[PDB]
Amino acid sequence: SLAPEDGSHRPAAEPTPPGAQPTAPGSLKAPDTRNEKLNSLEDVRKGSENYALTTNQGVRIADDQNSLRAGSRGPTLLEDFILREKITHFDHERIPERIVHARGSAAHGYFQPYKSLSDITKADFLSDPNKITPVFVRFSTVQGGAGSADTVRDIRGFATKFYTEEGIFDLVGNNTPIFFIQDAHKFPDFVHAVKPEPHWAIPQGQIAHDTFWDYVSLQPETLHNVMWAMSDRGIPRSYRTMEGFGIHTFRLINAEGKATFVRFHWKPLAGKASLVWDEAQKLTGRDPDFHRRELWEAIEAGDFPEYELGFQLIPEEDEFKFDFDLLDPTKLIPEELVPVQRVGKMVLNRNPDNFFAENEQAAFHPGHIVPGLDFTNDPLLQGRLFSYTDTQISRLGGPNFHEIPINRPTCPYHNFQRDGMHRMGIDTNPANYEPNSINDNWPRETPPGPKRGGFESYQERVEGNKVRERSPSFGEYYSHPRLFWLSQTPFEQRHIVDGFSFELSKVVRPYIRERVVDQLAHIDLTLAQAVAKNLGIELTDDQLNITPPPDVNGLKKDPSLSLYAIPDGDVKGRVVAILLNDEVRSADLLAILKALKAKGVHAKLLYSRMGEVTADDGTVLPIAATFAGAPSLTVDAVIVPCGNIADIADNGDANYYLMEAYKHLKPIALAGDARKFKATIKIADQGEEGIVEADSADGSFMDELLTLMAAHRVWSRIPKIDKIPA
Amino acid sequence: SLAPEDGSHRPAAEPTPPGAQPTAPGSLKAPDTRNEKLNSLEDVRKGSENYALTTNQGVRIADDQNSLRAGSRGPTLLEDFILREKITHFDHERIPERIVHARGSAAHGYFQPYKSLSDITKADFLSDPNKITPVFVRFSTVQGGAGSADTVRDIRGFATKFYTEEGIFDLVGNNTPIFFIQDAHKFPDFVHAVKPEPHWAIPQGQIAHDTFWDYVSLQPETLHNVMWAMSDRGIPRSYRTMEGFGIHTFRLINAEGKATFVRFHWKPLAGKASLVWDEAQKLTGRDPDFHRRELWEAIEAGDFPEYELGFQLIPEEDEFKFDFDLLDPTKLIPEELVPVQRVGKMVLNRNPDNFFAENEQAAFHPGHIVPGLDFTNDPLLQGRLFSYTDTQISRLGGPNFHEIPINRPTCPYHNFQRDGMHRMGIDTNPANYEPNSINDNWPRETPPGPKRGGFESYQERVEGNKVRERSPSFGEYYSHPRLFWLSQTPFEQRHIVDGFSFELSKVVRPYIRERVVDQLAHIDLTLAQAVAKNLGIELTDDQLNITPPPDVNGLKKDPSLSLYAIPDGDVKGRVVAILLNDEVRSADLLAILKALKAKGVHAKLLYSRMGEVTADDGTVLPIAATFAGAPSLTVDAVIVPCGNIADIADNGDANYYLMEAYKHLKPIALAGDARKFKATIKIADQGEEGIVEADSADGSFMDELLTLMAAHRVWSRIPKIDKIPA
Numbered sequence A, B: 001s002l003a004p005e006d007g008s009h010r011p012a013a014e015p016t017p018p019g020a021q022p023t024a025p026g027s028l029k030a031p032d033t034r035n036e037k038l039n040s041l042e043d044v045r046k047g048s049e050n051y052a053l054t055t056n057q058g059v060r061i062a063d064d065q066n067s068l069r070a071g072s073r074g075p076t077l078l079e080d081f082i083l084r085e086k087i088t089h090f091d092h093e094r095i096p097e098r099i100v101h102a103r104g105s106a107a108h109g110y111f112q113p114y115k116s117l118s119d120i121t122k123a124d125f126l127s128d129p130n131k132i133t134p135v136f137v138r139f140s141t142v143q144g145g146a147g148s149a150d151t152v153r154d155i156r157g158f159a160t161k162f163y164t165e166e167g168i169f170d171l172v173g174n175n176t177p178i179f180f181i182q183d184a185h186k187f188p189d190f191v192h193a194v195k196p197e198p199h200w201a202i203p204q205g206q207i208a209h210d211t212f213w214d215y216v217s218l219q220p221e222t223l224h225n226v227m228w229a230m231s232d233r234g235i236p237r238s239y240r241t242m243e244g245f246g247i248h249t250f251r252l253i254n255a256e257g258k259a260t261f262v263r264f265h266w267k268p269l270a271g272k273a274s275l276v277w278d279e280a281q282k283l284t285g286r287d288p289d290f291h292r293r294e295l296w297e298a299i300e301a302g303d304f305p306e307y308e309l310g311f312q313l314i315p316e317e318d319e320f321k322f323d324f325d326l327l328d329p330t331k332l333i334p335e336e337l338v339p340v341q342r343v344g345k346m347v348l349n350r351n352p353d354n355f356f357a358e359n360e361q362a363a364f365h366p367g368h369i370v371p372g373l374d375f376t377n378d379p380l381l382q383g384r385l386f387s388y389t390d391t392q393i394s395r396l397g398g399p400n401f402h403e404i405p406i407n408r409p410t411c412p413y414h415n416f417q418r419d420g421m422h423r424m425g426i427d428t429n430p431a432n433y434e435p436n437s438i439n440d441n442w443p444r445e446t447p448p449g450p451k452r453g454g455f456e457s458y459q460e461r462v463e464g465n466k467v468r469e470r471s472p473s474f475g476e477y478y479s480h481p482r483l484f485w486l487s488q489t490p491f492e493q494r495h496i497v498d499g500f501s502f503e504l505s506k507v508v509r510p511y512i513r514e515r516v517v518d519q520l521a522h523i524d525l526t527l528a529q530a531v532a533k534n535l536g537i538e539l540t541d542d543q544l545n546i547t548p549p550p551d552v553n554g555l556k557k558d559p560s561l562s563l564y565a566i567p568d569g570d571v572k573g574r575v576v577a578i579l580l581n582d583e584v585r586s587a588d589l590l591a592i593l594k595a596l597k598a599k600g601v602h603a604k605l606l607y608s609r610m611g612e613v614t615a616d617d618g619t620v621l622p623i624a625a626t627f628a629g630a631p632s633l634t635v636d637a638v639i640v641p642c643g644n645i646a647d648i649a650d651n652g653d654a655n656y657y658l659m660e661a662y663k664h665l666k667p668i669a670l671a672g673d674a675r676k677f678k679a680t681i682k683i684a685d686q687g688e689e690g691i692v693e694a695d696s697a698d699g700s701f702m703d704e705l706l707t708l709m710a711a712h713r714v715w716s717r718i719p720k721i722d723k724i725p726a
């Protein structure tokens, strides 16, 4: 027996705060978290305790420490089948990663509607609020490989598999409401431009390179999503704190056959929140698994990721009522024009057991719809429909990828398809064709109807010639970028300017930077000038005189496009660093932890070494990590209690912790003699907004700190951080 | 025409220093560089200038901007074969990454021996000092994915394909002289332990997690390579500044049939140099492609990576003369006991054209040997021989992987093997078997002989029973980790302590930390207490009294094991950051650059924005990057010339630049008023060793700076760094 006597090798099977227990496979951490899909996986889950070690053929291994050899210093024998099976399996572990969105993190959960939507769709999963649909959701970046970093500047994916009673519906979205391009035929061009460049395969997880900006500068249709990626949208705090969007106009179809245009949304109940650029970039070095970790740990803690499904609904007669085309996936529908109807709630409440078998092998595809939903002619969506079934053939080894457990429907599935590599289902049907008499034509077609009917496409009228031609209605590129720009707060605008300036600094060919500046001058002169100033470019007279694009349907902003304009802060599941000393004022600690607990905010106790310290009343305080070990990048706020401050007052790492947190606009709270640290961050004696200070950690000190955390970051601090060398 | 009129889109086809031009495919950058393998790839190289865009069937494409639809706002049509071919190719771009060493960077080059080695081996590539052998070399980390970061703490791979006249020889080594484990049968256990943990697939590119340290604690054979990995060996400065080793004892076979035991070495002619941990970790965030970039840029600059092949040679009759087993890959052969004999020089002088086609698809395998070499019974080598042919069947799609252009021999190859997926060669032989009469038995077997003979294995005596047993000669785990530790300078020892301490802090289950501390107590008590202390662990009385292991054949140390004990610095190809201000003293800059140029040291001119600044005498200075854009992490030294210092003196970034660089022990040089920056790094008025300072930049300011650079880092600065919040 190798486990510790005291059993401290095994995490408790109860929710616990981040860092309190080793993390574990989800069915071991949370065995009584169930849904129909998790239960259906029980046939393939395999345990391990008390079982003998075997070959894959079931033969018990006696010595798993040695190869078979002629003499104990002799050559290895070919007849060692135990070694060759174990090394063969190892040699073949890897499968191709996804072409795009290869980096991603996934969890199980469930969805439930708020009310029956049968007046507008016959989709069975939306028919009744007591209908519970298991989901599996994978969040992702786009560009980097599966071993790339999480907190890159990039678009994020947000893909949800709904295991419905009438089929799998995959809603395969991103975290911004448009895409970079108009027509699928250009996706390999755009993707190749953003991906590592082909001679030397650099850079990983980064859009800051010549070929990306070359393509943007030549394809103004990109500028709208490029605005989003240059904003703090591009660097979320957490997959729990970003929006999701289907991007395309789709159709809902009701029992009458009436079609409503719809765009899908997910609204994070934890609110919207992003990092700042310096913090995100540094975080790819300090913890490239930050988002994957924090999703896994939120679920372990019971901070379940929750999102509200929302529909923007446009009647069919309203197709041409806006000044942009509804089928143009570079255009958003402003919520001022078409509000988001709140339709249901999805809760992610269980991590997988095995990352490869459930996350790596999951296959999502937007063409996986169900009766009650239909497509539109959006020419980006149209070509997606081809790609996602094609790519699975090499990625997952063949056409039976729906038999891989995570991908199986939980409803019935029967048809006449047979064979293919690694076929699991053994068909007993005498017939493998229809029409057939020999099995009385089973399984049989089903006419469409209100419930449990076969799929029939909405009979849209198609009229035109066979052409490879972009719709003239798609040829407008600047008014949405502009609407986005003007809807941002002044600090969100500064961060956009900064993002463009940093990015274009990394473009080696200066003409490309200039051509991008030319584009920005078509969006907004203030933006173009501020980026230009940073690049050492001077606008021409011409550029200074480009007329701004028009408003969008009379809108000159929509605050729903900002992360922060309308407060939606939720502090539950956020995390605070508490910097310890070798004689902490216990009274400050009790007060801090109590107040954090009451709001569901977690804490991590930090020191100059691991082990424990002892507080003034003798309370033994276990240390979670060192200052350098768990940097301020990893928390939302920093609290420093009183006690023996001289212990840490000269510690470079302790000072730097506060300097880093301060630069990145995080709330900082200082009690008693911790206020000696005001000098490292240059705080005036009478204080400043966003630094909480008092004689001790009373009720008012904690309320102030938590009010700051609800506002996420201290934007007012921004002009002060230029001075700080950190 | 989209290219700019002035041709600034095209990099100069001539050697240029890093940053001076955009990087390019190697046959375009350096068309005049050639060797036999590069010439033989010419039949598959494809150009692009002046050619029409086509399908892969050779059909010219008219409109590559749109799908074929019925009306310009209509549905996409299934008859659009141009869309479907382009999207199909895109959808199937990826192949499985390598199971291990997935992250790697490769170049073309050549090898030449200094003299004929025919007295000791009949290997043709070693037979003639005029025989030049093309090579292809791939350097790699071990744990992370292909999209993981370069400057991780990990082992590095160093694999060389020699395209000889008698076959492909692959020398597939690492940058440490031993491996973690003794028998191949344990490779999947060890690799699963170091790899991201299977529930959540964390952490990437990192050995700092529970399962790695659990395995190490339970498998003391691992401690030797773990010592190496915890030292600064784990974080090389560049692939150009690390050692290479074959690890295993192999054999040389001469024309007489005499076997000589051999271990292979590569000596970096640019010397040995490593980062420090904080630098390396932060650099995975600031530039996760730093080593790939540095290798490609050195080659583009003509700073060709050079290495000297060396052999440790042991006569057959000395097999048992040492305290350790020569077949035990966890033991090193100290150079003090068996010197490295110089064999030849390898020069890497051309980057690939396409990273995927040449790098990602290269297949190296240590079983690819040639007459004049042979194996031994090292039971880790023995199992490697099975793995590398096996894994290629899935990674590269089948048994014809040697027909992928990069893998092809340049020498003849003919046999009776046929078919298989993506078969290129079209065999005209009437026979596909031997013996045959119908083609007069061609191609024919060839007897062994002194040159151009058939391969015959050396007839080593095998005697013993068929067992799965470890040789008892392998069961000693501590004496080599001890020799390594004692061979390290006091600063290298401190960095080892800090490596174990930081790693064990990331282990969640405290008992694992305690178990590893106990192992360290068996190696060296000082090492073990210094780690314990950092972990808040107290050694027991028993642990305090463990007798240390014996020295190795009378050796108390071997300085060849240290990176820095014996200086072997080389400044050629290193890089200096030059921090500019808005009115630089031009005579400072002229003197700085002239001195840098004479030693082949590169520069980058940094400022607070992109564009230009103008010097005191009116010289226009082009800026390469901003302070924040090209951090001190990426350079070897920082020099600040005089001028308008007030311009940058309260710049947070410019100050932090000197602080980061100071912390990481880099030479810093300050001229005239730039001396004001002494206050930011707390240098006394009279200065300190490792900060160069003067009224101006002469003669002798640059000789002192360049002398510091030859010594790589300022180790004596270490006790001073803790003071500074950076």
Ligand code: HDD
Binding pocket: A098, A099, A100, A101, A104, A138, A139, A140, A156, A157, A158, A159, A172, A173, A174, A178, A179, A183, A184, A187, A246, A247, A248, A329, A362, A363, A364, A380, A383, A384, A385, A387, A388, A389, A391, A392, B087, B091
């Ligand atoms: C026709 C090509 C094509 C186009 C135009 C798009 N995609 Fe895509 N996308 C793929 C081809 C593709 C793919 C190659 O099929 C992937 C990678 C591997 C896979 O299973 O599907 C994929 C992956 C992928 C994933 C990862 C799913 C997962 O986590 O497993 C998401 C969220 C998206 N896509 C979302 C979108 C959105 C919102 C788009 C535009 C509105 C979009 N993609 C355009």
Ligand code: HDD
Binding pocket: A087, A091, B098, B099, B100, B101, B104, B138, B139, B140, B156, B157, B158, B159, B172, B173, B174, B178, B179, B183, B184, B187, B246, B247, B248, B329, B362, B363, B364, B380, B381, B383, B384, B387, B388, B389, B391, B392
């Ligand atoms: C029994 C399995 C096994 C064992 C014991 C080892 N390896 Fe290995 N190694 C592989 C199985 C493997 C592999 C699975 O076959 C790889 C991955 C994919 C491939 O083509 O080869 C590989 C890749 C690989 C690469 C990258 C080659 C490239 O650039 O493509 C290097 C440098 C090494 N190995 C070096 C070593 C050294 C120096 C070892 C110990 C002395 C060693 N490996 C033990």
